[PDB]
Design a binder for this molecule. Structure first.
Ligand SMILES: CCCCCCCCCCCCCCCCC[C@@H](O)O[C@H](CO[C@H](O)CCCCCCCCCCCCCCC)COP(=O)(O)OCC[N+](C)(C)C
Ligand SMILES: CCCCCCCCCCCCCCCCC[C@@H](O)O[C@H](CO[C@H](O)CCCCCCCCCCCCCCC)COP(=O)(O)OCC[N+](C)(C)C
Ligand SMILES: CCCCCCCC/C=C\CCCCCCCC(=O)OC[C@H](COP(=O)(O)OCCN)OC(=O)CCCCCCC/C=C\CCCCCCCC
Ligand SMILES: CCCCCCCC/C=C\CCCCCCCC(=O)OC[C@H](COP(=O)(O)OCCN)OC(=O)CCCCCCC/C=C\CCCCCCCC
Ligand SMILES: CCCCCCCC/C=C\CCCCCCCC(=O)O[C@H](COC(=O)CCCCCCC/C=C/CCCCCCCC)COP(=O)(O)OCCN
Ligand SMILES: CCCCCCCC/C=C\CCCCCCCC(=O)O[C@H](COC(=O)CCCCCCC/C=C/CCCCCCCC)COP(=O)(O)OCCN
Ligand code: SF4
Lengths: 129, 99, 70, 59, 303, 156, 98, 83, 49
């Protein structure tokens, strides 16, 4: 038992949150948030959420924090609550995520409409005049 | 475990080699002698973020092909791609892709 | 001539050869002369665990045949 | 006398339009330039082995 | 013996990228009716060694006003990501076997822009900042279509597992199934690494340089695995290794050829290229590759 | 003893490394730049000696002054020279750069580039042939081979 | 409710407090909001994976997408404010008052 | 009809990429509803056993339920083999 | 050759472009007046080289 690896990752997560919550030099706050996001991705991956952790690490880190840094640059106890059996010959997380197209028709519709409306809203706001 | 060790080895080797590169020529003695904020780049970044979100929506497709409800998933995936194309077309026709 | 570029390409080829061959050799060496067992999907992981518990030496690749069924 | 260098009229028949579309979509001229460079690689270079070989001169 | 495997993966990549610089000057020189380096070493073979020695001995020009932190962090991240990209790949067997290997590579490539951003910001110059912003915008723009093309291609594979690509291409290459996607993927890998016609932009410089060439070779390996699948025999993986390495070498020589053959784009021209020619075709082909396995009843097995 | 042997061998290694890869930046002021480019032509192929074509001033090892240096231009040349990493050399190419040349008695011409920067090699001619400039580069390589930095540091 | 959930809730509370402080730099406000949504993502993902509730594996993706869209909207608003005043300082938004 | 033909011929020139994109997208939308193999794909997805088939308690009133896997009763996969 | 180019840019577009010359002004025309015609001939080789 690696001295509660989940606990250590959680403390690193909280320390990073205190680090960028002081709000020093927004580029440094963004660096702290990047470290915190990496630690959270590590927590999720070590828990067993491979695809969701990879979604964090790809989408969040590489798109949203990258755009944040781009805009800034323009300016000036565990192991016990776990399961017992196996999953079959597949991962339940992947099946539940893929059920979005067979079960979550309503969710897909509303999310796509929201994304299109967001594109339109960004255009209208950034017109200026 | 193995992935952690591999990442640690990569980081350690990179750090060691960069530091020796930065310190080997530091031992010998030598002389030792704005505003614009272009709006188009921000629009490019925001468009990238939105398209990345829609791609993230498109990512579970390889597993969605085994659902026994093939018609519904095909309709929903085509709907998502059609709205992606519609977003691209709207930003094209509103002079949002010009320089 | 153009074949004077070949020595550098050959050096590159050997350098790129090393990783795959080394990995395959290490996999055969550390897995009892066979391919490393792959475990996705959590069922063949259970197969590997049962093999390890059956071997008696705490190694999954030590295969127990029909001779061990008495 | 004088010549025209860029005074051509592209043909607007269906076959010519399809040929130009195929050129646009399949990058034929880019491949042709690649072939020119590839062919030009397989010919002897003009380099001399200075200082063991010297450039020609005159009295 | 895992550390031995890690080292035998890392060191040969650096040697390969060290000798890739010598092969680039030779191929270009011979395409220009001249020779490459053929004096330092029997056939320029010591040229890479000489360059490395000179670079590690030359004075580093620290700006004396820049932020040292990001200045030192950027090459570390660049080289670490460049070396990490190699681990997932199966040649035929991966050092680390990942279920979502392709997704992992996509995430690493997404991170790769932070080195550019931090180097541009810490340079303490407005013009360098403009160049860094321009490069970052180009990189994210092209990684969009990289991701879309990659998922469209994987729709015929059945999963994100990289080893399954060998099984998928057991009888026929993926190049014949979808060549237009391969064309756009190759051009996008050109644009990702800032290679001509998209090259619009001592120690740390050496580190950054090594990272770029390692990324080039890794892109070539990923492309060769994805689109030109070699046959793998379980009782003799050396054949697969040889075929894969030969295909990667051919693709890298193809980048050098393309560099020697063409002029370069303008920035607005490459943005227009992507956003108005690659993205619509990529979306149409993504729809087509979603529909095709259902139409032909050829859905891949794994789920 | 071994103390001088090790520093001598390391000095030879460093000199070989430094002279086997010379990265020049060229001030193409005037028609001597034409012969400079002809030395990069396929016939002479400066690249085959390890001398790259048009290196950046930030990672350049030797400055080649090829053309007339005017009074209006001298501050920029000095500024570029100052921004070079320490192991740097200067090659003066052509009569104009060597001593002012055919414009020596002019009100707007610097009478030799050595009024502004120190010079290691003087290449004579108007213009020197690309082969003459190659000879000058090889002479600079031999001069770099001749130097001894670790020996001096050891005997001091 | 074990200690990992408490740590993530503490991270959320710290991010909320940092948002509500406003030393300056509205960009830091957006950063605090994104830290809050990241904490929400992590803790909801842990809850969903622990209980083997298969069908909510969708929900973290939806949350991430919507929150990133909100982030883009906030970034656009910040850019407009900065173009109006030349800086993203909080105290420059004092034209409207109670 | 002439206007549409003229528009298509004018779009095929100076805009081939958009014409190809729209053609491919429209074909991808339309063809799946006309192909007869989509039902084959659905049936193949039906025949992939991910779960254990739990047996039923026999009460003498299930002639359609086989008692052994080799029994002729039950669904067949000869059609899949012939494919 | 060598050129100093001072320009005003609005975003990507070039608003104004003002070239600064004289970095290779050797005073050839004044030097020619102190030579004979044959002596002044070689300056024209160096004019447009
Ligand atoms: C009734 C009033 C209609 C007019 C008012 C409309 C109000 C706004 C429009 C949004 C409402 C649209 C209704 C869709 C509800 C989703 C559920 C329904 O469609 O059934 C689904 C069937 O899916 C349909 O194919 C969805 C087709 C509709 C989507 C295509 C176009 C959507 C456009 C709607 C507006 C969005 C923006 C505008 C775009 C132009 C379920 O599939 P099924 O397999 O049985 O069950 C799944 C559960 N399993 C897995 C256990 C079996
Ligand atoms: C694995 C650990 C690495 C640690 C760091 C070391 C880096 C790698 C070591 C390899 C370096 C390669 C050295 C080889 C240089 C010899 C080149 C030889 O061909 O040059 C000849 C010999 O020149 C010199 O005499 C050779 C000096 C090299 C030094 C000798 C051995 C040094 C090894 C000491 C290593 C200890 C390192 C300890 C600190 C890390 C003459 O050529 P040159 O005159 O140019 O060109 C004339 C052109 N012509 C012929 C056409 C007319
Ligand atoms: C940096 C890379 C971080 C994530 C890389 C690994 C991703 C991955 O999928 O590996 C998980 C791997 C195997 O998962 P599967 O592929 O699904 O199959 C195995 C079971 N059949 O198992 C693991 O989870 C081991 C590693 C998990 C714990 C560590 C996670 C990473 C933590 C990094 C924290 C440091 C971040 C600092 C800031 C970063 C900013 C760039
Ligand atoms: C592909 C393979 C590539 C491998 C990567 C590169 C390997 C690096 C190998 C390093 C070789 C050794 C280099 C040592 C020479 C350093 C440069 C030099 O000559 O400095 C001379 C300098 C001049 O100083 P002064 O004369 O006092 O004052 C002049 C200013 N007024 O003298 C010195 O400082 C001597 C320093 C002692 C060096 C002795 C030890 C050699 C270094 C071994 C390498 C250590 C790391 C491994
Ligand atoms: C019934 C079944 C039908 C199924 C559908 C299949 C139909 C497919 C038919 C068409 C597909 C072709 C698409 C392939 C990619 C097309 C992209 C394209 O055409 O864009 C070009 C641009 O493309 C380029 O020029 C990129 C070249 C950049 C230089 C790089 C050199 C590349 C050449 C070397 C060959 C590359 C080899 C690729 C294969 C790699 C193998 C892994 C348009 O630009 P413009 O000419 O300026 O016009 C638009 C403005 N009016
Ligand atoms: C019904 C299917 C829907 C889904 C498929 C589409 C998937 C992806 C395609 C959509 C991407 C977004 C499209 C954006 C549209 C932009 C329109 C536009 O503004 O373009 C015009 C130019 O192009 C136009 O004229 C507008 C569209 C022209 C018509 C395009 C084709 C229309 C239909 C052709 C195919 C019909 C069906 C195919 C049958 C073929 C037989 C098999 C302006 O271009 P500029 O950048 O300003 O350059 C001009 C300066 N030189
Ligand atoms: S040195 Fe001679 S050849 Fe060179 S620019 Fe001056 S006059 Fe011309």
């Amino acid at each position: 038992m690696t001295m509660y690896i989940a606990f250590i990752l959680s403390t690193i997560f909280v320390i990073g949150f205190v680090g960028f919550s002081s709000k020093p030099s927004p580029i440094y706050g963004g660096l702290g948030l990047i470290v915190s996001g990496g630690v959270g991705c590590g927590i999720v991956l070590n828990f067993g959420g491979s695809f969701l952790g990879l979604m964090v690490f790809l989408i969040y880190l590489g798109g949203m924090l990258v755009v944040f840094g781009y805009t800034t640059a323009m300016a000036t106890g565990d192991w016990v609550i776990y399961d017992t059996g196996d999953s079959g010959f597949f991962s339940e997380e992947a099946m539940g995520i893929a059920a979005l197209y067979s079960y979550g028709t309503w969710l897909v519709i509303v999310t796509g409409w929201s994304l299109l409306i967001g594109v339109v809203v960004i255009m209208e706001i950034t017109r200026g005049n | 475990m193995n992935i952690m060790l591999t990442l640690l080895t990569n980081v350690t080797l990179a750090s060691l080699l960069v530091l020796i590169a930065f310190w080997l020529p530091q031992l010998n003695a030598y002389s030792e002698k704005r505003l614009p904020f272009s709006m188009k780049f921000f629009l490019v970044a925001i468009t990238f973020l939105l398209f990345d979100l829609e791609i993230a929506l498109l990512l579970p497709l390889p597993w969605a092909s085994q659902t026994n409800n093939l018609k519904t998933m095909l309709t929903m995936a085509l709907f998502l791609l059609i709205l992606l194309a519609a977003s691209l077309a709207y930003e094209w026709t509103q002079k949002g892709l010009e320089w | 001539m153009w074949f004077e570029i070949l020595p550098g390409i050959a050096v590159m080829a050997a350098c790129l050869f090393i990783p795959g061959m080394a990995t395959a050799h290490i996999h055969k060496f550390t897995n009892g002369g066979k391919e490393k067992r792959v475990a996705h999907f959590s069922y063949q992981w259970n197969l590997m665990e049962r093999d390890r518990r059956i071997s008696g030496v705490n190694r999954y690749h030590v295969t127990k045949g029909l001779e061990n069924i008495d | 006398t004088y010549k025209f260098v860029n005074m051509r009229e592209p043909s607007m028949d269906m076959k010519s339009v399809t040929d130009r579309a195929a050129q646009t979509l399949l990058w034929t001229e880019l491949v042709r330039g690649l072939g020119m460079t590839l062919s030009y690689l397989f010919r002897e270079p003009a380099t001399i082995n200075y200082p063991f070989e010297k450039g020609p001169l005159s009295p | 013996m895992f550390m031995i495997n890690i080292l035998s993966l890392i060191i040969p990549i650096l040697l390969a990228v060290a000798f890739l610089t010598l092969v680039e000057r030779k191929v270009l020189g011979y395409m220009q009716l001249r020779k490459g380096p053929n004096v330092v070493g029997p056939y320029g073979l010591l040229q890479p060694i000489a360059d490395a020695l000179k670079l590690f001995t030359k004075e580093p020009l620290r700006p004396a006003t820049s932020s040292i932190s990001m200045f030192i962090i950027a090459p570390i991240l660049a080289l670490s990501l460049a070396l990490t990209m190699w681990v997932p790949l199966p040649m035929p067997y991966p050092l680390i076997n990942m279920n979502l290997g392709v997704l992992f590579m996509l995430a690493m490539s997404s991170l790769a822009v932070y080195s550019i951003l931090w180097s541009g910001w810490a340079s303490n110059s407005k013009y360098a900042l403009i160049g860094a912003l321009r490069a970052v915008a180009q990189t994210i723009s092209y990684e969009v279509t990289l991701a879309i093309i990659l998922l469209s291609v994987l729709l015929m594979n059945g999963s994100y597992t990289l080893s399954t690509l060998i099984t998928t291409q057991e009888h026929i290459w993926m190049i014949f199934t979808s060549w237009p996607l391969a064309m756009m993927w190759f051009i996008s890998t050109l644009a990702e690494t800032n290679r001509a016609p998209f090259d619009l932009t001592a120690g740390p410089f050496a580190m950054f340089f090594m990272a770029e060439y390692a990324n080039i070779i890794m892109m070539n390996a990923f492309t060769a695995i994805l689109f030109l699948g070699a046959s793998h025999d379980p009782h003799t993986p050396e054949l697969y290794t040889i075929n894969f390495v030969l295909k990667t070498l051919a693709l890298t020589i193809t980048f050098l050829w393309i560099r020697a053959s063409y002029p370069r784009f303008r920035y607005d021209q490459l943005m227009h290229l992507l956003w108005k020619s690659f993205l619509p075709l990529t979306l149409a082909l993504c729809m087509w590759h979603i529909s095709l396995p259902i139409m032909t009843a050829s859905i891949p097995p794994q789920s | 003893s071994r103390g001088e042997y090790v520093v001598a061998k390391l000095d030879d290694l460093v000199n070989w490394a430094r002279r086997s890869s010379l990265w020049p930046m060229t001030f193409g002021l005037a028609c001597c730049a034409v012969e400079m480019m002809h030395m990069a032509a396929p016939r002479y192929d400066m690249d085959r000696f390890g001398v790259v074509f048009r290196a950046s001033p930030r990672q350049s090892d030797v400055m080649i002054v090829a053309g007339t240096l005017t009074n209006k231009m001298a501050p920029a040349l000095r500024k570029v020279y100052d921004q070079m990493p320490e192991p740097r050399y200067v090659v003066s190419m052509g009569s104009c750069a060597n001593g002012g040349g055919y414009y020596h008695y002019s009100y707007s011409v610097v009478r030799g580039c050595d009024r502004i920067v120190p010079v290691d090699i003087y290449v004579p001619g108007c213009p020197p042939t690309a082969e003459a400039l190659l000879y000058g580069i090889l002479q600079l390589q031999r001069k770099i081979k001749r130097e001894k930095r670790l020996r001096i540091w050891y005997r001091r | 409710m074990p200690l990992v959930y408490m740590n993530i809730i503490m991270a959320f509370a710290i991010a909320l407090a940092g948002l509500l402080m406003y030393r300056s730099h509205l960009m830091s406000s957006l950063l605090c909001l994104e830290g809050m949504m990241l904490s929400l993502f992590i803790m909801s993902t842990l809850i969903i994976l622990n209980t083997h509730f298969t069908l909510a594996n969708m929900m973290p993706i939806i949350l991430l997408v919507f929150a990133a869209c909100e982030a883009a909207l906030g970034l656009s608003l910040l850019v407009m404010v900065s173009n109006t005043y030349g800086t993203d300082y909080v105290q420059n938004l004092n034209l409207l008052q109670c | 009809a002439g206007r549409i033909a003229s528009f298509l011929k004018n779009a095929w020139a100076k805009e081939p990429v958009l014409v190809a994109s729209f053609a491919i997208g429209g074909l991808a939308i339309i063809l799946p509803s006309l192909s007869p193999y989509t039902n084959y794909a659905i049936r193949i997805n039906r025949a992939t056993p991910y779960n254990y088939p739990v047996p039923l308690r026999d009460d003498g009133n299930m002639p359609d339920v086989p008692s052994h896997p080799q029994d002729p009763q039950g669904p067949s996969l000869e059609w899949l083999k012939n494919l | 050759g060598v050129l100093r180019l001072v320009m005003e840019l609005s975003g990507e577009m070039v608003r104004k472009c003002d070239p600064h010359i004289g970095l290779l002004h050797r005073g050839t025309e004044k030097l020619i007046e102190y030579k004979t015609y044959l002596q002044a001939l070689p300056y024209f080789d160096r004019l447009d080289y």
